[PDB]
Design an enzyme around this catalytic site. Structure first.
Site, PDB file in Angstrom:
ATOM      1  N   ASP A   1       0.814  -1.212   0.000  1.00  0.00           N
ATOM      2  CA  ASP A   1       0.000   0.000   0.000  1.00  0.00           C
ATOM      3  C   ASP A   1       0.851   1.267   0.000  1.00  0.00           C
ATOM      4  OD1 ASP A   1      -1.948   1.834   2.333  1.00  0.00           O
ATOM      5  OD2 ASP A   1      -2.434   1.563   0.210  1.00  0.00           O
TER       6      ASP A   1
ATOM      7  N   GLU B   1       2.220   0.136  -5.675  1.00  0.00           N
ATOM      8  CA  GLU B   1       1.107   1.070  -5.505  1.00  0.00           C
ATOM      9  C   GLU B   1       1.579   2.377  -4.861  1.00  0.00           C
ATOM     10  OE1 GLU B   1      -3.450   0.020  -4.814  1.00  0.00           O
ATOM     11  OE2 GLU B   1      -2.408   0.195  -2.889  1.00  0.00           O
TER      12      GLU B   1
END
Ligand SMILES: CC(=O)N[C@@H]1[C@@H](O)[C@H](O)[C@@H](CO)O[C@H]1O
Ligand SMILES: CC(=O)N[C@@H]1[C@@H](O)[C@H](O)[C@@H](CO)O[C@H]1O
Ligand SMILES: CC(=O)N[C@@H]1[C@@H](O)[C@H](O)[C@@H](CO)O[C@H]1O
Ligand SMILES: CC(=O)N[C@@H]1[C@@H](O)[C@H](O)[C@@H](CO)O[C@H]1O
Ligand SMILES: *[C@@H]1O[C@H](CO)[C@@H](O)[C@H](O)[C@H]1NC(C)=O
Ligand SMILES: *[C@@H]1O[C@H](CO)[C@@H](O)[C@H](O)[C@H]1NC(C)=O
Ligand SMILES: *[C@@H]1O[C@H](CO)[C@@H](O)[C@H](O)[C@H]1NC(C)=O
Ligand SMILES: *[C@@H]1O[C@H](CO)[C@@H](O)[C@H](O)[C@H]1NC(C)=O
Ligand SMILES: [Ca+2]
Ligand SMILES: [Ca+2]
Lengths: 594, 328, 594, 328
Positions: free
Chosen positions: A223, A293
């Protein structure tokens, strides 16, 4: 004669094995369908989505020719939003079922030939984590698991060691009365950043990765990667406004973050994550995917996660572009496609996603007319198409509701429950007072209604994934874009040995006419269409010089020729390919040399 | 004496069909329990057949049975010996080039030319014990390594399951020179073939505890995928031994005629379209052999008529029932 | 019985091959003797040293048991100092001979079993380089070979884009009247930094590396690695004095260099240098060495050049410590040794060097009494001992002379010519008016005088390298240091299976007495000395409780016991080893498991 | 006819001594030119010796010469056949474990037990053409690959150089059943042995153009270091073929006696202390064989007396000067 013919066969087989390219992995072929675990399907009738509801709707995922799921982070978290602050990485929250409900979901996924991906947040943790509760008391090895620094905190207010601000508020150094020291969080008051400079902490993340890899999660998706490491010298950041008075800078935008983002050694931690997952990828069919990401950054910093030709870091970073674009035209869409293909190193696999959890819906940001044309652009690009849940159909945003749980008011409009039926709550759950109000216009937009009627925006998503999976030109082919326009975007997909090209035309303009004789040379008097962004004119006849296109209109032309644009001297700087190969019609096999 | 005969019987029964059969026998039963039940039924059927041949071959010593004999002679020259000679070579081809294509299946062109090259090679060598020893090692390794980590559609399952039991009809031909066949040949079969049956069951359960049921369908070579999921550091010994022993298990005008018409059998047929093509004609004459004895048998007859009426192949009745009847 | 005995032998051989550790490379075993090419030996009688003079004195290099030479940078340079600004990497200056004189030097080195290493400066170039002369005119691909930026330069003075200062002066952005733009140099006015963000420039350095590797230079030694990449955002650096007025900061010390040193991607360029040299290291005996030589930085940044356990970067960075130390004591020397062994990753090979070109001499910085004790410390450490030219004997510094060539006044005292004989100019050259005046006291300090007399500071360097090469305890053995003192430094060198340890005692104090019964347990009533830094006393008898040590005094004790300190529970956090192995006396072979 | 005899002569001459000799022949000459000169001299000497044996063996058909014959019989049982049998095994041991130790030389313990295991293995196999074909491939590859990149102490050089020419004294024993020895056996030697001599010279110059002269001294196996400096991707074929062919070039009581006393020869002697130990006794009886024929010649005599008086070990004078003098 036979004694010579027997070795001429062995020489032929050893040539085919030596000339056969490497087969595309599961993450290279087949689209992804990102699913929100709380707003997809509910089974136990509680109000919130669960992992069992995704297993019940698994047959619909295969109906869209979807390869990977990429379930959004589902952990025991005290903060369900703001980068998903987790308090227990080994356990699951009471919602989304239990550990047995997850094991039955991944097992049922492997039975249908699908692949799974779970989100991973190694950057920070929650305040209720067992590591943070043991760090405030200096108990054993956990005394240095977080970035702790001695700060002054007298009667009235705390003073941080520097002006480092958090992404979601002020004063990214907070004081606690147990340890009497400030801790670095950078995200929220209850999301302390896990200090990665501790060799113990870097090894504890490996145990969390190996824990889920034994379960069979078939890859991860990091993330926050650029927030892992910070500068050891607690120096003040450079302010954007030099004349600005101190004691007033409280916004993350009015500060240059050169000491808290993309530090020296951050990529080496990402390089070590792949080395740990490489131990589980020794099987020929069980390969592990890893995504970085990294959002809200330039293009040169995003392509650095692809790795180097002598050291593997990650398969591909998630393409944040094409999602922040609110107004789409011929130039805005063309710039995004060329920005990724020109900066990415060759031999890597690109990717594209139109929407996501932290972004507005497609029909709410662009319009209902652009739902069909943007879905074709996702499947006509060389990268791996990534689709958000409810994006295959046109699902609009919802108004911001006041929830008792700690949730972000903004970016919550995309968390609306999936519209399955036209029953109560759009068939998402048979219970009342759901966690989020279902969109109002669900009687006209749902999977059951769009399946029974033709010319809907559900069949276009079905045959696009079928065309992308069946045809080899869309799976592994060249990408040659034609010049630049403000009212149409045209590119050609081709491959050596196919003797057939795919001409994709997207309008993105204002109901203009296109002259195909000015862009590509050698086209016949009449050309046929394949899918369209209207599903009503497929297999029709249109001449090149003069094509009527509406606002939300897109076409795919299939021409038979051996005049590929990638071979011409003019189209050499505007043609890109990942796995260069040659097709053979006589011998149906893939060739490297041709 | 007796143990030597038992070892000889076990050696000529355990062939290169135990690691090729499960993939085709599970695609018809679609289960685990019924799969083991079908395997045990095939084992007991082969046991009864060998026990009957042990009493039919030592009393008439083609030799067991005019027109029928001529048909058998004619069928054993085209569709019995050359077809089974091509299936063994097709099984060797799909196993020697399987580790090269890990992610995806091998091309049909590569496996055919490699199988045709294997046919021409052994046909030339034959025109001018190490395989068995290395073959039993893999069967022993998979069983042992499998235990250290453990503690219409019904007719095709029998066809693929009985291919592993290849050699139960030619046991009395190489066992009449050991000792008295009074109580040694039937004794070495009633405990020699079921020993292989229990060996096959213990080998099949070693696959289901490492890979799941759905992974067995998308795996042409089930042994090469078992070799990398258990013995990761040493994973090349499995695809090498089973290929080095398969090529060993596979009269100038007879060999040339058996190698010419066998090459045209792999062009329009795959490895699955030939097992049900050979077992159809083979069991058709097997039932006629049991019927000829009548004119164990109560079960051998009721199970043979079911194996023929259940599929009722169209490209087979015009070769054995039309090819020679125009010649005769 | 024989049929069983034949396989029991094959099982024994396959066990020895599987248990035999990897043999130490040429850069791990054997000391290095860094040689200055201009102040070593002259042959053509011109005044300056040459490469032919090093070939004539090659027999003396082997007499010191030296393995590698590591010749200092010898290129066609317009600036012989200040990081050796090179104007031609493929050619050699008129001094140091020609290209044929270099090919005869490396060939003669390989005949005597020695190894060569040359210095490489890929960071910057010279003003007279063909790349810079073609960059000011924007001729072809060379228009972006350097960091160019548009700056204002009116009648009176130039204005740099930022306050980035050079290491050797002001205003690291200089203006030229041809290109009308400022160029980034960071070192000197005539040393423009080569922009490494250009893919063409990064590939041009590969051609320079492969050029010398085909000649057989047997490795490289990078000079400036941390100055390769800079920040793309031309922002002002953080000043150390916040209240300091601008337009006055002109010193490199009063500025935090966070945008011009150790940038993101700098190590990846160093990782690519090893990948290029790896193509020439495929031979079993021809391995390529690569050194980073990053000076003036902390210890955590120096150990980052060692690489990661899954990606190789460099063999070892050159240990700048032990050279900047002016006053040596028990605590200053102990801190340096522990700072390197505790921060270096395990399995790597450390290194040590007492002096160098950019540092004062040993006897001039520490004293003539510390010449003998510092030479023992260099050879009793697990790292690769690196010796400067003229360091084996006590050579003092010289006064700064006014040379017409552009040379640094400071750090020039170490460039004095080598004192070979007691003839004119100490036998360095038969010519007059040499490039640098030879030290005055050369009639008493020279290689010929120290060879004929015993108890000199030349034989101690000879038998130390012999003891380091013959004995296996010094080549690859454990390093267990005993506590901490301000008047003596004691450590033990041991290895499994040797049944014998080496106790090294260095005073570094003020003529104090040492009680060995308080530090190591199990020592007998009497112990023998081996070298005893001062000569003569070797092979004498000294009791443990009470040892007379002078100021510059050092001893090596050889005790026979099976009570190695690395096995005890107390000495577990103070014992380090690179290649853990076990020795066997019965079977003379190296074992991993024991 | 003639070409067959030439091929047979070349086959029994090119042995496992061409890649073991240069290391010992360069350590005495310490040069490249003199090394090739010594090699050419050894080649022409072997040619002349074979040409003389072709005229001495076809006229008296031990057979060429009482006491001398007895001595030859006694020497060929201890220091000729068993010693040459150990050198071939030592050459195989130093070549099969050479790639394992890349940076440094292999241990003396490992090479001796591996050589002793090779002795016991072939002695057991023998007690119960492929080698020649693979041997000529390496000689052809090194010569061909060497050309694509090209365009007291004097007695020990002969001892190590003549070991490569091993088999020139037993040529007439396996060439009298081909054709008439009138003008075929001497003709196949005057152009067959010099052909090997030119083959050895072209093979030695292939080493000096890749590695320098000083690298040949610190290289036990000179062929394995030539295989990685030229054929880097395929470098395992050189140490494999020269080891697979060496073990082939190497009567129950005769084999056991040749394998028992050969193991005690490698314990106190290295690979260099045995070549000068076997060539001493071998050439001592070779000179007696030439002297027996007498009872070109002006040069053959002056060069033979030098080859004997130059070396003139403690474990040798008690076998040839003490062993039989107690028997006689
Ligand atoms: C951008 C931002 O969130 N700034 C926060 C503010 O919201 C909050 O009211 C205050 C006290 O809580 O501290 C600061
Ligand atoms: C509340 C509602 O919309 N119910 C409709 C229903 O009338 C219709 O028969 C069915 C078939 O499409 O779909 C739903
Ligand atoms: C037809 C069209 O849009 N041409 C544009 C042009 O106006 C623009 O100047 C250029 C720079 O991006 O790119 C292209
Ligand atoms: C100028 C000078 O010092 N000359 C001396 C010389 O007297 C001495 O004989 C020689 C031997 O060491 O060394 C030198
Ligand atoms: C921010 O920059 C602008 C100058 O354009 C100016 O308002 C001032 O320097 C800064 N604003 C404040 C409130 O200080
Ligand atoms: C800065 O520029 C002036 C002008 O040449 C020079 O005198 C001075 O030495 C420079 N500063 C330093 C530290 O060199
Ligand atoms: C440097 O720092 C000191 C404060 O200790 C003070 O002299 C001033 O802030 C700076 N010096 C000058 C000349 O500005
Ligand atoms: C050893 O080190 C510590 C801290 O570095 C210091 O306090 C102590 O005085 C030292 N002990 C001696 C004997 O020098
Ligand atoms: Ca962090
Ligand atoms: Ca630079």
């Amino acid at each position: 004669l036979t004694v010579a013919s027997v070795l001429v066969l062995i020489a032929a087989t050893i040539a085919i094995i030596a000339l056969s390219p490497k087969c595309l992995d599961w993450w290279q072929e087949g689209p992804m369908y990102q699913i929100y675990p709380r707003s997809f399907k509910d089974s136990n009738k509680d109000g919130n989505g669960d992992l069992k509801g995704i297993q019940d709707k698994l047959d619909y995922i295969t109906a869209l020719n979807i390869k990977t799921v990429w379930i959004t982070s589902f952990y025991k978290s005290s903060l369900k939003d703001f980068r998903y602050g987790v308090e227990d990485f080994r356990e699951v929250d009471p919602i989304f079922g239990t550990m047995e409900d997850f094991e039955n979901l991944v097992a049922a996924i492997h039975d249908k030939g699908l692949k799974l991906i779970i989100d991973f947040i190694p950057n920070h943790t929650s305040d209720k984590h067992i590591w943070f509760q043991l760090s405030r008391t200096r108990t054993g090895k956990y005394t240095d698991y977080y970035i702790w620094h001695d700060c002054t905190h007298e009667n009235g207010k705390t003073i941080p060691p520097n002006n480092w601000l958090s992404v979601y508020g002020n004063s990214s150094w907070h004081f606690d009365e147990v340890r009497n020291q400030c801790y670095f969080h950078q995200f929220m008051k209850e999301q302390p950043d896990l200090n990665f400079r501790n060799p113990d902490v870097q090894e504890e993340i490996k145990e969390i990765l190996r824990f889920w890899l034994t379960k069979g999660v078939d890859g991860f998706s990091l993330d926050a990667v650029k927030f892992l490491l910070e500068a050891k010298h607690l120096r003040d950041e450079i302010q954007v406004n030099k004349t600005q008075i101190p004691d007033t800078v409280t916004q993350y935008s009015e500060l240059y973050h050169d000491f808290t983002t993309t530090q020296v050694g951050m990529h080496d931690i990402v390089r070590s994550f792949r080395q740990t997952m490489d131990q589980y990828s020794t099987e020929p069919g069980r390969y592990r995917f890893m995504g970085t990401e990294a959002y809200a950054e330039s293009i040169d910093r995003t392509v650095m996660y692809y790795g180097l030709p002598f050291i593997q870091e990650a398969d591909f970073p998630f393409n944040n572009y094409l999602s922040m674009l609110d107004t789409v035209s011929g130039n805005s869409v063309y710039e995004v496609i060329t920005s990724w293909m020109e900066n990415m190193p060759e031999g890597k696999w690109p990717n594209w996603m139109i929407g996501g959890p932290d972004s507005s819906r497609l029909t709410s940001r662009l319009g209902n007319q652009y739902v069909n044309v943007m879905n074709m652009l996702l499947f006509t690009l060389p990268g791996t198409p990534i689709t958000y849940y409810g994006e295959e159909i046109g699902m609009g945003n919802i108004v911001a509701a006041n929830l008792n749980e700690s949730y972000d008011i903004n970016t919550l409009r995309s968390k609306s429950p999936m519209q399955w039926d036209n029953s109560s709550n759009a068939g998402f759950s048979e219970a009342s007072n759901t966690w989020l109000p279902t969109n109002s216009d669900y009687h006209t937009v749902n999977v059951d209604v769009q399946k029974t009627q033709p010319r809907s925006a559900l069949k276009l998503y079905q045959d696009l994934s079928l065309l992308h999976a069946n045809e080899l030109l869309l799976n592994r082919g060249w990408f040659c874009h034609l010049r630049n326009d403000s009212h149409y975007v045209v590119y050609t997909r081709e491959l050596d040995g196919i003797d057939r090209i795919f001409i994709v035309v997207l309008n993105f303009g204002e109901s203009t006419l296109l002259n195909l004789h000015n862009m590509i040379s050698g086209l016949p008097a009449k050309m046929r269409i394949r899918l369209s962004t209207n599903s009503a004119d497929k297999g029709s006849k249109v001449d090149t010089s003069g094509i009527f296109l509406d606002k939300g209109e897109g076409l795919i032309f299939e021409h038979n020729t051996k005049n590929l644009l990638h071979r011409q001297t003019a189209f050499r700087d505007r043609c890109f390919v990942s796995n260069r190969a040659c097709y053979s019609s006589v011998l149906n096999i893939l060739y490297t040399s041709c | 004496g007796l143990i030597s005969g038992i070892s000889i019987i076990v050696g000529t029964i355990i062939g290169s069909g135990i690691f090729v059969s499960p993939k085709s026998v599970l695609s018809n039963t679609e289960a685990v329990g019924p799969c083991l039940i079908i395997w045990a039924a095939c084992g007991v059927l082969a046991t009864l057949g060998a026990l009957c041949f042990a009493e039919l071959g030592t009393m008439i010593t083609y030799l067991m049975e005019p027109i029928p004999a001529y048909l058998f002679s004619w069928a054993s020259l085209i569709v019995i010996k050359p077809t089974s000679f091509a299936i063994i070579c097709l099984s060797f081809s799909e196993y020697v080039c399987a580790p090269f294509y890990v992610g995806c299946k091998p091309p049909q062109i590569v496996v055919k030319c490699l199988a045709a090259a294997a046919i021409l090679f052994i046909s030339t060598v034959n025109s001018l014990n190490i395989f068995t020893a290395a073959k039993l090692v893999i069967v022993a390794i998979i069983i042992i390594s499998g235990l250290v980590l453990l503690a219409g559609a019904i007719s095709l399952a029998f066809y693929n399951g009985l291919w592993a039991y290849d050699g139960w009809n030619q046991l009395n031909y190489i066992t009449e020179e050991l000792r008295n066949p009074y109580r040694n040949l039937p004794l070495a079969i009633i405990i020699g073939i079921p020993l292989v049956t229990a060996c096959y069951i213990l080998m099949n359960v070693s696959y289901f505890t490492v890979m799941t049921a759905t992974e067995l369908l998308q795996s042409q070579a089930v042994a090469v995928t078992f070799g990398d999921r258990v013995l990761y550091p040493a994973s090349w010994i499995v695809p090498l031994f089973v290929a080095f022993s398969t090529i060993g298990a596979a009269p100038a005008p007879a060999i040339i005629f058996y190698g010419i018409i066998a090459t045209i059998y792999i062009i329009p047929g795959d490895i699955n379209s030939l097992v049900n093509y050979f077992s159809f004609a083979a069991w058709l004459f097997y039932g006629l052999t049991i019927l000829g004895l009548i004119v164990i048998p109560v079960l051998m007859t009721l199970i043979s008529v079911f194996l023929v009426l259940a599929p009722i192949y169209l490209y087979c009745v015009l070769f054995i029932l039309s090819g020679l009847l125009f010649y005769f």
